[PDB]
Amino acid sequence: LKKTTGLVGLAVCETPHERLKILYTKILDVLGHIPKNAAYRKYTEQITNEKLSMVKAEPDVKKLEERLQGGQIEEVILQAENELSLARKMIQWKPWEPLVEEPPASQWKWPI
Amino acid sequence: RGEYVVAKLDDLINWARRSSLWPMTFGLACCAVEMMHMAAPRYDMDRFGVVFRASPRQSDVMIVAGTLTNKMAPALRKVYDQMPEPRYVVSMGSCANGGGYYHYSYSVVRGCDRIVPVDIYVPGCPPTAEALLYGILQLQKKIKREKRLRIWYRR
Amino acid sequence: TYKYVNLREPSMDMKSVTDRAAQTLLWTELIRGLGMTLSYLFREPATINYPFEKGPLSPRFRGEHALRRYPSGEERCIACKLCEAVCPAQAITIEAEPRADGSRRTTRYDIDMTKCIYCGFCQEACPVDAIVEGPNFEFSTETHEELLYNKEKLLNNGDKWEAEIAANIQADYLYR
Amino acid sequence: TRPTVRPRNDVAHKQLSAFGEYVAEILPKYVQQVQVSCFNELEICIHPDGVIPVLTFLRDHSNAQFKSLADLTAVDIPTRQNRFEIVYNLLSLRFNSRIRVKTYTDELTPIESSVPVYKAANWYEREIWDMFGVFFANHPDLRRILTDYGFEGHPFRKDFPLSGYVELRYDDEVKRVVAEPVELAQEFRKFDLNSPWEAFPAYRQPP
Amino acid sequence: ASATRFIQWLRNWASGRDLQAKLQLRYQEISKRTQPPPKLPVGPSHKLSNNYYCTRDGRREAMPPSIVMSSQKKAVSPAPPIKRWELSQDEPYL
Amino acid sequence: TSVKPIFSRDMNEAKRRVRELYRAWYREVPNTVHLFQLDISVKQGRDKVREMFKKNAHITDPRVVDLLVIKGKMELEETIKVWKQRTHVMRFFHETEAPRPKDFLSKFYVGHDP
Amino acid sequence: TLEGIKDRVLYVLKLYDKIDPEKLSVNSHFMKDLGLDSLDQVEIIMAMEDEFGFEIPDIDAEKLMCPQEIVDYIAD
Amino acid sequence: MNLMLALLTNFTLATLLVIIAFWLPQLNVYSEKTSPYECGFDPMGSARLPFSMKFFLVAITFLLFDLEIALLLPLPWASQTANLNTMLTMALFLIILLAVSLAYEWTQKGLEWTE
Ligand SMILES: CCCCCCCCCCCCCCCCCC(=O)OC[C@H](COP(=O)([O-])OCC[N+](C)(C)C)OC(=O)CCCCCCCCCCCCCCCCC
Numbered sequence A: 001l002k003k004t005t006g007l008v009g010l011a012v013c014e015t016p017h018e019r020l021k022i023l024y025t026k027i028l029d030v031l032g033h034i035p036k037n038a039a040y041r042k043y044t045e046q047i048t049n050e051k052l053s054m055v056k057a058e059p060d061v062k063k064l065e066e067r068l069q070g071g072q073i074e075e076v077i078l079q080a081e082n083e084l085s086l087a088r089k090m091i092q093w094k095p096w097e098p099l100v101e102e103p104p105a106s107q108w109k110w111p112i
Numbered sequence B: 001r002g003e004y005v006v007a008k009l010d011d012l013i014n015w016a017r018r019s020s021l022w023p024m025t026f027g028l029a030c031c032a033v034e035m036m037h038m039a040a041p042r043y044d045m046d047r048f049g050v051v052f053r054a055s056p057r058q059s060d061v062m063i064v065a066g067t068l069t070n071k072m073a074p075a076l077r078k079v080y081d082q083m084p085e086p087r088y089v090v091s092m093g094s095c096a097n098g099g100g101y102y103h104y105s106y107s108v109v110r111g112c113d114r115i116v117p118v119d120i121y122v123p124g125c126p127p128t129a130e131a132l133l134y135g136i137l138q139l140q141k142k143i144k145r146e147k148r149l150r151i152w153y154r155r
Numbered sequence C: 001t002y003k004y005v006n007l008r009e010p011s012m013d014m015k016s017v018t019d020r021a022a023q024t025l026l027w028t029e030l031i032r033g034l035g036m037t038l039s040y041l042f043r044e045p046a047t048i049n050y051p052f053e054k055g056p057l058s059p060r061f062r063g064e065h066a067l068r069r070y071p072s073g074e075e076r077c078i079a080c081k082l083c084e085a086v087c088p089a090q091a092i093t094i095e096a097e098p099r100a101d102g103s104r105r106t107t108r109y110d111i112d113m114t115k116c117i118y119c120g121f122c123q124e125a126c127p128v129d130a131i132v133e134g135p136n137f138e139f140s141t142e143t144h145e146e147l148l149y150n151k152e153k154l155l156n157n158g159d160k161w162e163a164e165i166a167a168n169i170q171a172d173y174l175y176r
Numbered sequence D: 001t002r003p004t005v006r007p008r009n010d011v012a013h014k015q016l017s018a019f020g021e022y023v024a025e026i027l028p029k030y031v032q033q034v035q036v037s038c039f040n041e042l043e044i045c046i047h048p049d050g051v052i053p054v055l056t057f058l059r060d061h062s063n064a065q066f067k068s069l070a071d072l073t074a075v076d077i078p079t080r081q082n083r084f085e086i087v088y089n090l091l092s093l094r095f096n097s098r099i100r101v102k103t104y105t106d107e108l109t110p111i112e113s114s115v116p117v118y119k120a121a122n123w124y125e126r127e128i129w130d131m132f133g134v135f136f137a138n139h140p141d142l143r144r145i146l147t148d149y150g151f152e153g154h155p156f157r158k159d160f161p162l163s164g165y166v167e168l169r170y171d172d173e174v175k176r177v178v179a180e181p182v183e184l185a186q187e188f189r190k191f192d193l194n195s196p197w198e199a200f201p202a203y204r205q206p207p
Numbered sequence E: 001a002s003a004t005r006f007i008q009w010l011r012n013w014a015s016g017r018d019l020q021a022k023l024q025l026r027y028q029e030i031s032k033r034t035q036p037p038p039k040l041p042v043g044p045s046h047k048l049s050n051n052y053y054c055t056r057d058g059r060r061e062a063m064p065p066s067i068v069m070s071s072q073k074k075a076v077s078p079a080p081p082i083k084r085w086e087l088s089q090d091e092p093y094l
Numbered sequence F: 001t002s003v004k005p006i007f008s009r010d011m012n013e014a015k016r017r018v019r020e021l022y023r024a025w026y027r028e029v030p031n032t033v034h035l036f037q038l039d040i041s042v043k044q045g046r047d048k049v050r051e052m053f054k055k056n057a058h059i060t061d062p063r064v065v066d067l068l069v070i071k072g073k074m075e076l077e078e079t080i081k082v083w084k085q086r087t088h089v090m091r092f093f094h095e096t097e098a099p100r101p102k103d104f105l106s107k108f109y110v111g112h113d114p
Numbered sequence G: 001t002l003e004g005i006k007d008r009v010l011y012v013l014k015l016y017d018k019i020d021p022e023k024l025s026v027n028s029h030f031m032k033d034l035g036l037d038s039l040d041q042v043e044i045i046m047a048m049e050d051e052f053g054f055e056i057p058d059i060d061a062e063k064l065m066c067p068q069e070i071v072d073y074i075a076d
Numbered sequence H: 001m002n003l004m005l006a007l008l009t010n011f012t013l014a015t016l017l018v019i020i021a022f023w024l025p026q027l028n029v030y031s032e033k034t035s036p037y038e039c040g041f042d043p044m045g046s047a048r049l050p051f052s053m054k055f056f057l058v059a060i061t062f063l064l065f066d067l068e069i070a071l072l073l074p075l076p077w078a079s080q081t082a083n084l085n086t087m088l089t090m091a092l093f094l095i096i097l098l099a100v101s102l103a104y105e106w107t108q109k110g111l112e113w114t115e
């Protein structure tokens, strides 16, 4: 087991495989309440399932870290927690809805 | 003779004051880096009797080493007022001399001599450490010329 | 590649533990630091004896400004105002008119030395090597007004310093 | 490889374009324009209502991870009815990438404070308020940061004069530093530099 | 350089280093303050032919930004994930 | 004409914020004079506060009123915490500036400014 | 102590110099009769908070426009 | 006498130096010069406001420990006693109880400053 993650304040996780399975499964559950055709759901389910596949099929932490390309396994756990927090927030924002308002005529024209 | 005595007494106090100049630990911007290089071993301002002291109550000279902004102006005037007399101001660098590169800014004082009286103006941006040392030695020779007791005698 | 600056595990063999106990109780690493300052006490100091000795400089040094002449004595400046246009500080002020012999010459050429940032752009911009920054850095004054140079002051600087300025330009003009 | 010409990195341009429409697909409620410059910088132009949703998504989404707010600034363009353009420059360490998010506002319209997303944004928003007068809603502590105490105006606006309106000096009668209308011994000399000949045909605007 | 032998020994011992091999005061190993004149090279555009400016004009190749989307399939990231750094083989631990 | 509010939804709500700010300034003047050791009286300080509120009496835009109140609160905070110095407090009284008469003739004699 | 409040309140309105005591009555409206404006009224309300030593919210304060209506208010 | 003469001379010499220091130099007193110092800006609040003491418990312990040394300083004289068995036992006893009290205050976190 790792003695240290190397990043100050990031504690080493004793059970990273199970923790990742909990988090990705939670992320998928939250996406279920997002509309099917929302691009956030389709993309996040796709990339979330890839990580869940890699955790299930790879028992060694170091070999799993190489597959995930997310840094330390504790870094990957934190990213999963961040994605789960974003998915909940997305439900109230509903950014899949059409553009709230067009900008004025020359709002983005440069040079003036 | 009274004149001979006050002439010699002027030399003593003038010698003591210029031989023991303590600048206030006061720096503002880039010019303070060259001021740091005057204290550094190559020039060793300490060897002339020039020693930094933090407290204005224990300072004889204010070296305005850098830009004076409007927000800073009341503070600079405050610590100048809090220096016991006699006290001297050396203006270092274009910013302190007259605004320099920021002369036309809305936030800069166009010369520290709008705020305090200035004894010596050291030109440059920044003046070399040697140029500042030349300015300090110029201040010393100004103090050497003072005639306080001679003028008092003829009052 | 990276390296760790502080990720090492002290050994726990009795000799190493005692070595550290002696360090803690006998102040061995503090005594060691005293040795370093002692060695400096007996090193020759780096101080130079200003003003009898001077810090080294190079021909490119940017100091007090000066207006130069041709060997005949005619002014090099022909009032093109390139130095005035480039000056980052707007330190230069120029007026010009046809001279009594028709020459294109300045009637005003001021440098506010309290505005100037001693950047040397003016001498880069000058097409005739008229305005230069000379090697003088010992010209601090007792009044602000003494640092507002007009054309007479700048020409006097050129006449005062031309011997050094010409030699400094000779050493460096092939890098320009 | 012409020696004096900056080389083109086409791989980055393709990668940033792909991610550009990736963000537009996911946040259509807010994204108004996406562009990639010829030196491979991706800019996302959004409606101001989407400052928190867009920034939160870029920080938190697993395919973005823009964890660092490199810079937050404003630009004043007086000819626009929304004269202030607010610019977020973000950095992604995971993907070694940068992205710029831009929105807009006017003198009287507040922008949501993004401190809840990036704690770095605290002082950047104080600077924008100080120098441009843009108000940020729900800022924990919004006040001047750069200008003098009691300073009036927002200096970085294009119509604020370079030398301001007041200057300082010490007045012996009142024994304090005073502020008075600005007079310059030498007025700043305005230079008209632009050549009357077009330089870059590629950027010509239609007549 | 002018220190006596005993003084050199004393300060060598005190510091634990041989201080005479790397003195911090400069003597004669520094360059002469007068040098021969240079003869600097020219650049790649110094030619008399095949040198039309329009073929070497970087500014006129700059283009307005490509509009990807305006308001007038696999997930992607801005770039591939960053490769993990390797430990130094010069000196991994300080 | 549909715009995002700052705080107040209408001038009636805005005027409430103004009154609360006026109370805060009115209460603070005695503290400012005492703490800063000013040589003006509390009446002068409160008259000046009234003068500053009066110059903006003609505003009818709730968003503009809200921004004036926000700045008023910031100015008050600078004073209460002695971030301002005596020079900053006294700048409201323009003590060192000579009167500029407003009659046509007086301007005519002195220069070209209208 | 209703009877005494009509004296306390009128005691304050007399100190506030802008008021003319001859023109002042327990029913004189601050705006129309006494020639005051919103900020003067606000200042009056602050003086009342001192004598009776309690806070009068703005929602409450704005309704008090005559010396009488304050007395009715203090009673509660 | 010698002692009182020596003390009087020292403190008179110091007093004369202060008298010269105040009456010899030229003075120029005004309000800003004599204002309290705080790095250029006016102080916020009186310097007489309470200043919390985070080592208050060590300070009280100092009183108790400072009296122990009054009990110990006679030890050089007590060592001249013929009854050295009792004296050595009571000397060691007193110092140990001082050490025990120190160890108690240490283990109970009395020597850590309040945060
Ligand atoms: C370890 C202790 C060290 C002690 C060191 C003692 C210092 C030894 C050197 C003494 C030099 C002589 C003193 C001159 C310095 C005076 C300060 C000064 O600059 O004033 C300028 C002033 C200048 O005054 P002024 O009239 O020209 O102008 C000032 C007024 N305005 C501001 C309007 C311009 O000189 C004097 O006023 C008088 C000078 C007299 C010099 C003779 C001094 C006599 C000493 C007796 C003083 C009476 C009090 C008794 C003190 C104890 C006596 C020893």
Ligand SMILES: CCCCCCCCCCCCCCCCCC(=O)OC[C@H](COP(=O)(O)OCCN)OC(=O)CCCCCCCCCCCCCCCCC
Binding pocket: C024, C025, C026, C027, C030, C031
């Ligand atoms: C026959 C039986 C015999 C029985 C008796 C035997 C007794 C002898 C054996 C006992 C041990 C002997 C040494 C005791 C000396 C005191 C040691 C000591 O107190 O050092 C510890 C102290 C704390 O060090 P620290 O690492 O910070 O903390 C420890 C972990 N808590 O460390 C420090 O004090 C740091 C001090 C910092 C300030 C130092 C500044 C000066 C350093 C240079 C001084 C050189 C000494 C010169 C002395 C001159 C004497 C005239």
Ligand SMILES: CCCCCCCCCCCCO[C@@H]1O[C@H](CO)[C@@H](O[C@H]2O[C@H](CO)[C@@H](O)[C@H](O)[C@H]2O)[C@H](O)[C@H]1O
Binding pocket: H084, H085, H086, H088, H089, H092, H093, H096, H097
């Ligand atoms: C928290 C409570 C802690 C209490 C700790 C008490 C510790 C006391 C330890 C014993 C100290 C004295 O120890 C005792 O000293 C006496 C004399 O000094 C010694 O006595 C010895 O010297 C004396 C004379 O000097 C002779 O009379 C005697 O014949 C000889 O044996 C004892 O041999 C020794 O046992």
Ligand SMILES: CCCCCCCCCCCCO[C@@H]1O[C@H](CO)[C@@H](O[C@H]2O[C@H](CO)[C@@H](O)[C@H](O)[C@H]2O)[C@H](O)[C@H]1O
Binding pocket: H095, H096, H099, H100, H102, H103, H106, H107, H108, H109
């Ligand atoms: C007869 C006199 C000589 C005998 C020594 C008498 C003094 C004894 C001192 C106390 C001894 C035991 O009491 C003390 O308890 C605390 C627990 O908080 C320990 O203290 C602990 O935290 C402090 C602060 O970080 C540090 O000292 C140390 O890192 C750690 O050990 C001490 O290591 C231990 O010494």
Ligand code: SF4
Binding pocket: B029, B030, B031, B032, B065, B066, B067, B092, B093, B094, B095, B096, B100, B101, B124, B125, B126, B127
């Ligand atoms: S004068 Fe030049 S070096 Fe000195 S503070 Fe100003 S800009 Fe910096």
Ligand code: SF4
Binding pocket: C083, C086, C087, C088, C089, C090, C091, C092, C111, C115, C116, C117, C118, C119, C120, C121, C122, C123, C133
């Ligand atoms: S050195 Fe620079 S700032 Fe000074 S006059 Fe020349 S161009 Fe202007």
Ligand code: SF4
Binding pocket: C076, C077, C078, C079, C080, C081, C082, C083, C084, C094, C122, C125, C126, C127, C128, C129, C130, C131
């Ligand atoms: S650039 Fe040279 S020639 Fe032209 S105005 Fe300046 S000094 Fe004169």
